[PDB]
Amino acid sequence: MKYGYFDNDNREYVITRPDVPAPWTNYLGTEKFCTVISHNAGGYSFYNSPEYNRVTKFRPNATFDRPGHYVYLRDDDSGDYWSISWQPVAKSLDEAQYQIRHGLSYSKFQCDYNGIHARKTLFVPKGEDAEIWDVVIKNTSDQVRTISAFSFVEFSFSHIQSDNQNHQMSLYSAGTAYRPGLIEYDLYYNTDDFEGFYYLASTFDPDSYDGQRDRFLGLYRDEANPLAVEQGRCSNSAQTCYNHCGSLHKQFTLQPGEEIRFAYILGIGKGNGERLREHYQDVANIDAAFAAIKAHWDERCAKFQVKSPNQGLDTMINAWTLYQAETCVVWSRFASFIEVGGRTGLGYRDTAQDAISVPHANPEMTRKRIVDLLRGQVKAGYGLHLFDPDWFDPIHGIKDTCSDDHLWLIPTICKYVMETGETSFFDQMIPYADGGEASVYEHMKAALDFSAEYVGQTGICKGLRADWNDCLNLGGGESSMVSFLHFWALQEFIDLAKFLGKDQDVNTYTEMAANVREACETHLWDDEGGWYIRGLTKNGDKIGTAQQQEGRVHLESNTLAVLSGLASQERGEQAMDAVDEHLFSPYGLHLNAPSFSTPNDDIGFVTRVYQGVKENGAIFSHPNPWAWVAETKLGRGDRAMKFYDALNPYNQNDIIEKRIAEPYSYVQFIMGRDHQDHGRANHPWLTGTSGWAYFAVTNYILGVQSGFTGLSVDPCIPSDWPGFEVTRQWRGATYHIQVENPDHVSKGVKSITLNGAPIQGRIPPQAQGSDNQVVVVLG
Amino acid sequence: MKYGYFDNDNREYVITRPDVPAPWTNYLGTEKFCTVISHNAGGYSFYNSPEYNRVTKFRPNATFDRPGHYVYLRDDDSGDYWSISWQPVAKSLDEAQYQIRHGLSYSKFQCDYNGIHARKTLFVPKGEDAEIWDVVIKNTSDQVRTISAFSFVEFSFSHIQSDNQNHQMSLYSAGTAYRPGLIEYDLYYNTDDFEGFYYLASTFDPDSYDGQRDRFLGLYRDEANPLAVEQGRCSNSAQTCYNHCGSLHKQFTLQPGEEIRFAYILGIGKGNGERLREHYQDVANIDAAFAAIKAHWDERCAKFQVKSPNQGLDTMINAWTLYQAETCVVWSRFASFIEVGGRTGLGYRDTAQDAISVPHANPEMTRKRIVDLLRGQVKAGYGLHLFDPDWFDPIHGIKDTCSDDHLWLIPTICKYVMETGETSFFDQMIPYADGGEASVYEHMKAALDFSAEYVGQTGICKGLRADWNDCLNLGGGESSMVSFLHFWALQEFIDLAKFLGKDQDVNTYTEMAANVREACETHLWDDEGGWYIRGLTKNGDKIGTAQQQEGRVHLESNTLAVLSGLASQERGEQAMDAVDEHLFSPYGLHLNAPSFSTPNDDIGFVTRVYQGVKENGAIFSHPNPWAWVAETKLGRGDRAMKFYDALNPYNQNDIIEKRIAEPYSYVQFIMGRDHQDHGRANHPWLTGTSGWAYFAVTNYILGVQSGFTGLSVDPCIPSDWPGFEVTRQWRGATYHIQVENPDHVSKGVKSITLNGAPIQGRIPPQAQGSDNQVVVVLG
Ligand SMILES: CC(=O)N[C@@H]1[C@@H](O)[C@H](O)[C@@H](CO)O[C@@H]1O
Ligand SMILES: CC(=O)N[C@@H]1[C@@H](O)[C@H](O)[C@@H](CO)O[C@@H]1O
Ligand SMILES: CC(=O)N[C@@H]1[C@@H](O)[C@H](O)[C@@H](CO)O[C@H]1O
Ligand SMILES: CC(=O)N[C@@H]1[C@@H](O)[C@H](O)[C@@H](CO)O[C@H]1O
Ligand SMILES: [Ca+2]
Ligand SMILES: [Ca+2]
Ligand SMILES: [Ca+2]
Ligand SMILES: [Ca+2]
């Protein structure tokens, strides 16, 4: 069963029926003002901080996703009314036809009902901290129709906690005032003229308005049947205290076939409302703004485009996965329909990993996040697990420290410089979160030295509070995953030092890496099962062995052993074969197996989690891409693609009854085989799976990698692929790559020609604006 | 306009029409399990801690109060359905007749609709941590009817924050399982067999059930139209993860005039559900449980009953205000429809004051709270503003310290001992919150000495973080209110030391009191306006003078100057006359006037609050009773009663269109004259106004006061009262007091006879179980 389809031509996902089993959301905004909106227009907006600057309210985890950004239409001749989005009015689907087009940074809502065609495009224009609601109403009947339009948003008290509780204070913390076509919402306790004011304006001159939620909705009514909409007029309410809303009403008389256009604007700051409502009265300004949003993503998408035998891969890499990955880098991980309060700011390991995915498309935001992370690192070398970057924009103890956080930053920084060529970045001085400063280069060394110090007697990195798996708390225990990550980070750093001619560091860290490898190969391999263990308890008991009854095979350790380059080809293939045989499912790779069923605090909280859920036996998406990378390094392209196809949301477009979540977005986890809902996907959008999936496909399957001295092309694809093509923009130059596979192998470059001339190895960075033809023949 | 009436005979408030402009709530429970339920059955339950042990969910501050404890009835012949409570189904009020009877610790819901009579009584039985839903369905039509009943509650994830956010965790933190007539809800991460399990059981053997909210309610539906109820059967869902509910269904066939009875039980702990569903199958056990709830309050009400010319006073004092005051003492201030998360435990000054109100009715809980407060006090002498008593059941700095908190405890402890006679209490050793211990007596001295130390150069108590008025932050500034409170506390302590023969303390504190009085009379009186100022800024500027444009007259300072006994009769009358002339309104006394309009941080946050709202110019209820006490001390009974009648909710039973809130409950504040909603009452139930109102009327207007050596009767009533009668239970003996006012004076005792014998002054405590006739003649 499906509810829509991918429109490759317009780069939109079209939802043909609104009764989806869950809200399918999209993100509006590319700067500071953001909106998480569903296909039913449910959702909310916030400015910069979702926790402290929420703009409109949201009642989460309920059967309906309300409130939202709604437009109610009413036939003033009959009194009949409906919303442009299906919900909240929910007009019968046998009577009204609804369509939703989720695009990159914009969503189009359409409704055709009883002779009236209506469209509403919600998008946050660049350069403004506001959301435009571009509305078009057309009379498609053969008679004169009189239609009234009503807007609605419930203004937030700005602090999420103030919306959820402490109403003894928040109910008297704001007020509304009205001026022609503008409802001004004042957060009375926020003296800032910008941040302390929100508004809902209309390009038309209103017939009526409502600033009080209780008056617009009415007694014992809700968003589904507002009193104002039912009676055909607002009550012109505006006062201080209680709950406020932004409702502007206008009646229109439409001749047969006639159409009108106007806009509503939800925004922040005094003065802006009056300005923008006037600015957008000229619809050409709305079109220009929308055109800038299209350009924004056209520019980004064009920097890496692929044409291959796999339509699913092409569709996702060329738009959707890039979009999801950059959304994570820009908006972080704490504003969705699942993350709705509490945690805010940046998760260290989350953004550290996300930032490695799109430096080719958004180098500026990537650099900004990397700098945030560097500022969020302490002298000791570890990172603050969760912090607000604004705190350090010109501290927890070792007990709350997570052992992997800081290590992910290393490969990410190296990638950023490789991509942009900003080698001077390594010399920039950045202050530590706990005082003092050091160069970016020294920040990196502080991180690597920390992991070398915090190891067990066997030489394996301590899990501390928790490693990648938040539910793996070994403290004094040891994590295979961290040691493998450390090796990967070291290999990346060695190449850097080598490139910078830092001979001493090359020796130091090459030696450090040597010790990590020997320690891992000596203690972490289980030669009975043929794979790498997950780690060891603080008491020295190995976790993840062939003899245990629970949690024998682990995805993170086995995939990272290969991805990091630590494991030999032999152990790599066998470990990954164990992953395929025991963890693979049509929905993706399980995190471990069998699931844990006996609580054991020596292993961690994972033993106290439901089987097939979250970290305990579920298909945790994040690590799946590591498996793809591992397979490319082993030269098994067919295996890699089998893993990719199984997790690719695109291929599950017609099994929504089982998946439930968005077919255009990766999710945090899918219920594993041990849970009765096996197959149901949970938490779309803000998951590092997107950044990693993008990175894995572009850099390892398609094999295009930017480097300190050149561009590398070394693919690992399915043996039956005749070839593929990629357009890659790197450092201001374009590389038109064509890969040919006449002998039908999976990996191995026979030859590479640059502009008709044969070359050996890396493609040297070409002149600015140059277009280069690169032919790669596998063999 | 009214929506109900007081039923004095049954001690219930009868709501005749459910479309009240706001939820009118009641509290179920007297021990640890509590339920805040509305007249529409909306609301939630919690066990001990509302913040960490919520049992069922609540979506606050919305147009509907959901979810709740609902019972849906369905006619299986027509498919028609409705709820016993009006909402959530909301059957037309032209078709169904609804009635709600809120009683003391129980609520009765009734619905008569299309030939079916249904009743549902919700109450928490003593001895169990559960809520009983006693349901009776009667076929009042002339034909055989087939009716199905469905229950519904949405189980909470226990931590309020987990219900409001962090669903990435909470959505996989619980599960449901089913056993005959019992839905078992397991909080998977809470290993305690009692606290980590909830349940919804039924005395009948179910035809179907639902443990999954999404299955019972269905897609794109809510509590108003559950899929299960509409189709006439549950889906028998039960699993781990997602949102859970407790729905048990049973179909009944009823002959004309036939009625059936059964019960649903919402509770906590494994094993209890199976036990109670079986126990209550014998309806006689439900009746016995209900009878225990009636007895519980009959016993308490009988300890103080009044018969006077004022029906409003009688109705409230004899039941409702006692009920509200004890509810505050037992359940604290953080569980209502307004307080729904964040703050939890005990507010120092709040409970310190509440505990002075009902020691005659619930001495055990009073003692418990006093001990909690003593444990919550630090060696320095001040109290922790907000703390959880469980923390200290066998610490903030001076910056977060509120200057009045600890002082309120003094009069309260003295009253407790006067009331119970437990003089040994003063010797009990209690540990300080920050280490060490001392006798109750020394805890008290530590409090008094703190206020003597923290004063300005003029000798007035520093406001510190804030005094009684949380929005009055003077820090180094000085508060008139605190100095007056200090004097009152000192006078109480002096009488105690005198009674205990602690001569040295008598001298010490009598001297301390002397200095406070001289300092107050010298610096706080404004002889131009004729009243006491509110205080002084840190820079020495007086606040509350006749020459200022804003905040000239303040209620707290002027009422406390008299209540404390500090002010002379002359200044007392004039100050209170200023209060009457400038602060009185038909709705009660404003906190100050004129309202502040210019922000000034030297005065406090009150200058940043909307005019006529909260602390800035609103009718803040709490201080009103102090005005009544002040007037009785001035001997102006008519003035006192004018103030009482204006604030008494009872007298506003027919102006709900303006008041909005419960006519049987005091509220935190009523919008003042400066706000357009002047008259609207906000935050019923959990306000110290109830405890103070009860204390003021019983002890000062009716003038009955327990003492260390005797019972005092010295009333101050309206001059036109011919007299009144009071039944007072004190220390195991009963005092039948009859007050006669033949000369029609307001205050002044001509004579008092005890059992026919004339006496002078205090009535010595009589023998246990004795009944004494006390005739007081005013003159
Ligand atoms: C105007 C306003 O919101 N005042 C409230 C006050 O009533 C409440 O007691 C306190 C609790 O922390 O918070 C705020 O100061
Ligand atoms: C099973 C479970 O609830 N795990 C979550 C983990 O996924 C999440 O990253 C972390 C954030 O603090 O909280 C919990 O550990
Ligand atoms: C936002 C956040 O804290 N995400 C965490 C991620 O950091 C962690 O690596 C992973 C595995 O436990 O689980 C996610 O929920
Ligand atoms: C529960 C609570 O903190 N209640 C406070 C009370 O202590 C304070 O004395 C009064 C005046 O400001 O305002 C109430 O809101
Ligand atoms: Ca403001
Ligand atoms: Ca070019
Ligand atoms: Ca449990
Ligand atoms: Ca007796």
DSSP letter string, A398-451: TTS-BSSGGGGHHHHHHHHHHHH--GGGGG-EEE-TTS-EEEHHHHHHHHHHHH
Which chain B residues touch A230 with a CB distance below 8 Å?
A: none
- B239 vs A213, A343, A676: nearest CB: A676
Q: Which residue is associated with the tokens 């922000």?
A: B599
Binding residues of A for N-acetyl-D-glucosamine: 470, 614-615
Nearest protein CA to atom 3 of ligand 4, as residue: B347
Of all residues in chain B, the one with the smallest CA distance to A19 is B220
Q: Between chains, do B64 and A222 touch, taking CB under 8 Å as contact?
A: yes
Give the minimum alpha-carbon distance from A324 to chain B in angstroms, rounded to a whole number.
Answer: 19
- Single out the residue of A40, A675, A2, A658 nearest to residue A337, CA to CA: A40
Which chain B residues touch A175 with a CB distance below 8 Å?
A: 610
**Which amino acid makes up residue B381?**
G
B470 tagged catalytic? yes
DSSP letter string, A691-708: HHHHHHIIIIIS-EEE-S
Which chain A residues touch B188 with a CB distance below 8 Å?
A: 608, 610
Residue B495 corresponds to which tokens in the numbers above? 């009488």
Q: What is the CA radius of gyration of chain B?
A: 27
Asked whether A44 and A142 are in contact (CB, 8 A), the reply is no
Q: For strand B182-187 and strand B174-179, is the pairing parallel, antiparallel, or unpaired? A: antiparallel
- Single out the residue of A774, A765, A627 nearest to residue A713, CA to CA: A774
List strand residue ranges (DSSP E) for B707-770, in order: 711-713, 723-730, 733-740, 749-754, 757-759
User: Could you tell me the CA-to-CA distances from A33 to A28, A30, A123 in Å, in that order?
Assistant: 8, 8, 10
Q: Taking the alpha carbons of A527, A528, A533, A536 in that order, is the dihedral positive or negative?
A: negative
DSSP symbol at B544: S
Q: Between chains, do A610 and B172 touch, taking CB under 8 Å as contact?
A: yes
Q: Which long-range contacts (CB under 8 A, 24 or more apart) does A393-399 make?
A: A395/A433, A395/A434, A398/A464, A399/A465
Of all ligands present, the nearest one to the C-alpha of A735 is 6
Asked whether A201 and A176 are in contact (CB, 8 A), the reply is no
- Does residue A300's CB lie within 6 angstroms of at least one atom of ligand 2? no
Which residues on adjacent β-strands are paired with residue A763?
Answer: A711
Which burial class, exposed, middle or buried, applies to B309 when counting CB atoms under 10 A from its CB (0-12, 13-18, 19+)? middle
- Single out the residue of A627, A623, A641, A629 nearest to residue A687, CA to CA: A623
Q: How far apart are CA A692 and CA A619, in angstroms?
A: 15
Mutate to test the interface with A, among B212, B239, B241 (most CBs of A within 10 A): B241
**Which amino acid makes up residue A247?**
S
Asked whether A625 and A693 are in contact (CB, 8 A), the reply is yes
Give the minimum alpha-carbon distance from B664 to chain A in angstroms, rounded to a whole number.
Answer: 20
Q: How far apart are CA A657 and CA A2, in angstroms?
A: 8
- Single out the residue of B324, B422, B407, B293 nearest to residue B368, CA to CA: B422
**Which amino acid makes up residue B730?**
W
Q: Which residue is associated with the tokens 């020997």?
A: A518
Q: How far apart are CA B569 and CA B573, in angstroms?
A: 6
- B165 vs A188, A214, A340: nearest CB: A340
- Does residue A443's CB lie within 6 angstroms of at least one atom of ligand 2? no
Give the minimum alpha-carbon distance from B21 to chain A in angstroms, rounded to a whole number.
Answer: 7
Asked whether B38 and B17 are in contact (CB, 8 A), the reply is no
Of all residues in chain B, the one with the smallest CA distance to A51 is B165
Give the minimum alpha-carbon distance from A506 to chain B in angstroms, rounded to a whole number.
Answer: 42
Mutate to test the interface with A, among B3, B89, B220 (most CBs of A within 10 A): B220
Which chain B residues touch A171 with a CB distance below 8 Å?
A: 61, 682
Please list every protein residue whose CB sits less than 6 Å from any atom of ligand 4.
Answer: B 333, 347, 349-350, 468-471, 615, 668
Residue A637 corresponds to which tokens in the numbers above? 């392209």
Q: Between chains, do B189 and A19 touch, taking CB under 8 Å as contact?
A: no
**Which amino acid makes up residue B410?**
I
Q: What is the CA radius of gyration of chain A?
A: 27
Which ligand 3 atom sits nearest the alpha carbon of residue A386?
A: 3
* Resolution in Å, one decimal place: 2.0
Residue-level length of chain B: 779
Domains and CATH numbers, chain A: 1-302 (2.70.98.40), 303-309+703-779 (2.60.420.10), 310-702 (1.50.10.10)
Provide the experimental method for this PDB entry: X-ray
Which ligand 3 atom sits nearest the alpha carbon of residue A334?
A: 1
B274 alpha carbon, distance to own chain's centre: 34
Name residues whose C-beta falls within 8 Å of residue A324's C-beta, 6 or more positions apart in sequence. A665, A666, A685, A690
Asked whether A42 and A277 are in contact (CB, 8 A), the reply is no
Which chain B residues touch A217 with a CB distance below 8 Å?
A: 63
DSSP symbol at A649: G
Collapse the DSSP code of B540 into the 3-class scheme (helix H, G, I; strand E, B; otherwise coil) and give the result.
coil
Collapse the DSSP code of B443 into the 3-class scheme (helix H, G, I; strand E, B; otherwise coil) and give the result.
helix
Helices (H), A536-687: 555-563, 569-583, 624-633, 637-647, 656-659
- B220 vs A90, A172, A221: nearest CB: A90
Query: B219: how many CB neighbours lie within 10 A of its CB?
Result: 12
- A241 vs B167, B613, B668: nearest CB: B613
Q: How far apart are CA B526 and CA B545, in angstroms?
A: 6
Q: How far apart are CA B580 and CA B583, in angstroms?
A: 6
State in Å, rounded, how far the first CA of chain B is from the last one. Answer: 42
Nearest protein CA to atom 4 of ligand 3, as residue: A350
Q: How far apart are CA B752 and CA A482, in angstroms?
A: 86
Asked whether B486 and B512 are in contact (CB, 8 A), the reply is no
User: Max CA-CA distance within chain B?
Assistant: 85
User: Which of B385, B400, B470 gets mutated to test ligand 1 (max ligand atoms within 8 A of its CB)?
Assistant: B470
Q: How far apart are CA B487 and CA B491, in angstroms?
A: 6
Q: How far apart are CA B344 and CA A166, in angstroms?
A: 11
Name residues whose C-beta falls within 8 Å of residue B649's C-beta, 6 or more positions apart in sequence. B316, B659, B661, B662, B663, B664, B665, B666, B667, B681
List strand residue ranges (DSSP E) for A393-492, in order: 429-431, 437-439, 462-464, 475-479
Which ligand 1 atom sits nearest the alpha carbon of residue B613?
A: 1
Give exposure, A212-232, as e/b (b: 16+ Cβ within 10 Å).
Answer: bbbbbbbebbbbbbbbbbeeb
Mutate to test the interface with B, among A168, A221, A609 (most CBs of B within 10 A): A168
- B608 vs A189, A613, A683: nearest CB: A189
Q: How far apart are CA A48 and CA B115, in angstroms?
A: 58
Asked whether B439 and B401 are in contact (CB, 8 A), the reply is no
Q: How far apart are CA A241 and CA A224, in angstroms?
A: 24
Q: How far apart are CA B647 and CA B645, in angstroms?
A: 6
- Helices B363-375 and B321-331: crossing angle, nearest 10°? 40
User: Which of A343, A401, A471, A472 gets mutated to test ligand 2 (max ligand atoms within 8 A of its CB)?
Assistant: A471
